[PDB]
Design an enzyme around this catalytic site. Structure first.
Site, PDB file in Angstrom:
ATOM      1  N   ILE A   1      40.501  11.464  -3.297  1.00  0.00           N
ATOM      2  CA  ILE A   1      39.869  10.231  -3.749  1.00  0.00           C
ATOM      3  C   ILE A   1      40.425   9.758  -5.080  1.00  0.00           C
ATOM      4  O   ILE A   1      39.887   8.830  -5.685  1.00  0.00           O
ATOM      5  CB  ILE A   1      38.338  10.377  -3.911  1.00  0.00           C
TER       6      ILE A   1
ATOM      7  N   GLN B   1      45.056  15.738  -9.079  1.00  0.00           N
ATOM      8  CA  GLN B   1      44.260  14.952  -8.124  1.00  0.00           C
ATOM      9  C   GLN B   1      42.759  15.158  -8.226  1.00  0.00           C
ATOM     10  O   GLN B   1      42.262  16.060  -8.904  1.00  0.00           O
ATOM     11  CB  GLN B   1      44.708  15.280  -6.693  1.00  0.00           C
TER      12      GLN B   1
ATOM     13  N   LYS C   1      38.387  18.020  -9.678  1.00  0.00           N
ATOM     14  CA  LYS C   1      39.615  17.573 -10.297  1.00  0.00           C
ATOM     15  C   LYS C   1      40.528  18.773 -10.322  1.00  0.00           C
ATOM     16  O   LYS C   1      40.253  19.741 -11.012  1.00  0.00           O
ATOM     17  CB  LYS C   1      39.326  17.067 -11.719  1.00  0.00           C
TER      18      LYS C   1
ATOM     19  N   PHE D   1      32.711  18.125 -10.863  1.00  0.00           N
ATOM     20  CA  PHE D   1      31.844  17.129 -11.460  1.00  0.00           C
ATOM     21  C   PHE D   1      30.867  16.661 -10.415  1.00  0.00           C
ATOM     22  O   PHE D   1      31.072  16.876  -9.235  1.00  0.00           O
ATOM     23  CB  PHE D   1      32.654  15.911 -11.922  1.00  0.00           C
TER      24      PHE D   1
ATOM     25  N   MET E   1      29.306  14.041  -8.006  1.00  0.00           N
ATOM     26  CA  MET E   1      30.015  13.005  -7.270  1.00  0.00           C
ATOM     27  C   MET E   1      29.525  11.613  -7.701  1.00  0.00           C
ATOM     28  O   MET E   1      28.324  11.386  -7.865  1.00  0.00           O
ATOM     29  CB  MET E   1      29.765  13.186  -5.790  1.00  0.00           C
ATOM     30  N   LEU E   2      30.443  10.673  -7.884  1.00  0.00           N
ATOM     31  CA  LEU E   2      30.048   9.334  -8.305  1.00  0.00           C
ATOM     32  C   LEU E   2      30.528   8.298  -7.305  1.00  0.00           C
ATOM     33  O   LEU E   2      31.050   8.662  -6.244  1.00  0.00           O
ATOM     34  CB  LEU E   2      30.616   9.045  -9.692  1.00  0.00           C
TER      35      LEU E   2
ATOM     36  N   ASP F   1      40.751   6.128 -23.925  1.00  0.00           N
ATOM     37  CA  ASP F   1      41.282   5.523 -22.714  1.00  0.00           C
ATOM     38  C   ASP F   1      40.258   4.742 -21.886  1.00  0.00           C
ATOM     39  O   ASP F   1      40.287   4.744 -20.659  1.00  0.00           O
ATOM     40  CB  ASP F   1      41.993   6.589 -21.865  1.00  0.00           C
TER      41      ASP F   1
END
Ligand SMILES: COc1ccc2c(c1)[nH]c1c(C)nccc12
Length: 343
Positions: free
Chosen positions: A32, A39, A55, A105, A107-108, A154
């Protein structure tokens, strides 16, 4: 040539295989996200019964160390009481798997760039923009607490994600380029469109560079287009100048790279140099936002909450964020008190 016993490709990335399951715990679904760090995959955690985003950092010491800094800052943040910390993506855990560092992490959903693409780059309402802005300001407020003093470095649409695709709650992600208030080792930072003047000018920088970025993002969320879309640093500064004018003299007198964009006349004042740009300060934000003409492209006429009064409070907050002087540029705490958020 075989890499990491066949697990890596030539770019040091873990070859993602849908359905594969790691450590008898995570069931990989699909890729994703890609990035120089490696990735991002969507996986299912059998143990916690939930979806998580993993990640996977490239198998290269250079990237592995970059990620360890991200882990440190994340752990440092998630160790702080306040609910302000709830606007920063949460690192559940991290582990090494087949020589790859993995960060798990929550999930968003979609990132704000995706959201802008669905409006075909026409922007979201001023009311949705206000909700985002308030959360962003609270996140910056949190990153500014003394013990932290974190500069994201960033911020851009791609790094702000919605929690749920239905609700408007957002979270900031990717601290791979982040640092704590420290020493200007590196100078070429931030994504170009959101690069503050001090960075372009090669000057010292602190947490204020994040507020400049926020200003560029808010205007873009509403108009649908990047406020300053330069093709290179010089073009970037010129587009900034079209809107805010020539930077104050005291700042340019200390800018190590000032002579890359400007020229000092024999009398002490500065002017744009040689080389399609309206005159300094002639491209008013008042007009870009369409304050008195129904918003961007006049596409907001008649829309509830888009009166001239509303638009003025918005133009004001933005100008306070795009202040050339990082010393007087509005800080998080006060932006949150601005009449733009006043209920
Ligand atoms: C699609 O959901 C997510 C959740 C966390 C992250 C994400 C996407 N992309 C990230 C990046 C690029 N860095 C850190 C955390 C995340």
């Amino acid at each position: 040539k075989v890499y990491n016993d066949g697990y890596d490709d030539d770019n040091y990335d873990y070859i993602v295989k849908n359905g594969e399951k790691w450590m008898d715990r995570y069931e990989i679904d699909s890729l994703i996200g890609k990035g120089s760090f490696g990735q991002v995959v969507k996986a299912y955690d059998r143990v916690e019964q939930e979806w998580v985003a993993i990640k996977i950092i490239k198998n290269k010491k250079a990237f592995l160390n970059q990620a360890q800094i991200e882990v440190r800052l994340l752990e440092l943040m998630n160790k702080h009481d306040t609910e302000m910390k709830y606007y920063i993506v949460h690192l559940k855990r991290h582990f090494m798997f087949r020589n790859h560092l993995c960060l798990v992490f929550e999930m968003l959903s979609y990132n704000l760039y995706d959201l802008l693409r669905n409006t075909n780059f026409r922007g979201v309402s001023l009311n949705l923009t206000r909700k985002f802005a308030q959360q962003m300001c609270t996140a910056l407020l949190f990153l500014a607490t003394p013990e932290l003093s974190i500069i994201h470095c960033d911020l851009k649409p791609e790094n702000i994600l919605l929690c749920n695709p239905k609700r408007s709650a957002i979270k900031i992600v990717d601290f791979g380029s982040s640092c704590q208030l420290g020493q200007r080792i590196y100078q070429y930072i931030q994504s170009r469109f959101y690069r503050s003047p001090e960075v372009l000018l090669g000057m010292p920088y602190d947490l204020a560079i994040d507020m400049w970025s926020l200003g560029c993002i808010l205007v873009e969320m509403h108009t649908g287009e990047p406020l300053f879309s330069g093709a290179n640093e010089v073009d970037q500064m010129n587009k900034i100048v079209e809107v805010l004018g020539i930077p104050p003299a005291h700042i340019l007198d200390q800018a190590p790279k000032a002579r890359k964009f400007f020229e000092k006349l024999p009398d002490g004042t500065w002017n744009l140099k040689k080389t399609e740009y309206k005159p300094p300060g002639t491209r008013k934000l008042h007009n870009i936002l369409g304050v008195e003409t129904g918003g961007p492209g006049g596409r907001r006429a008649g829309e509830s909450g888009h009166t001239v009064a509303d638009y003025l409070k918005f133009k004001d907050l933005i100008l306070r964020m795009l202040d050339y002087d990082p010393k007087t540029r509005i800080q998080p705490y006060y932006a949150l008190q601005h009449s733009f958020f006043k209920k």
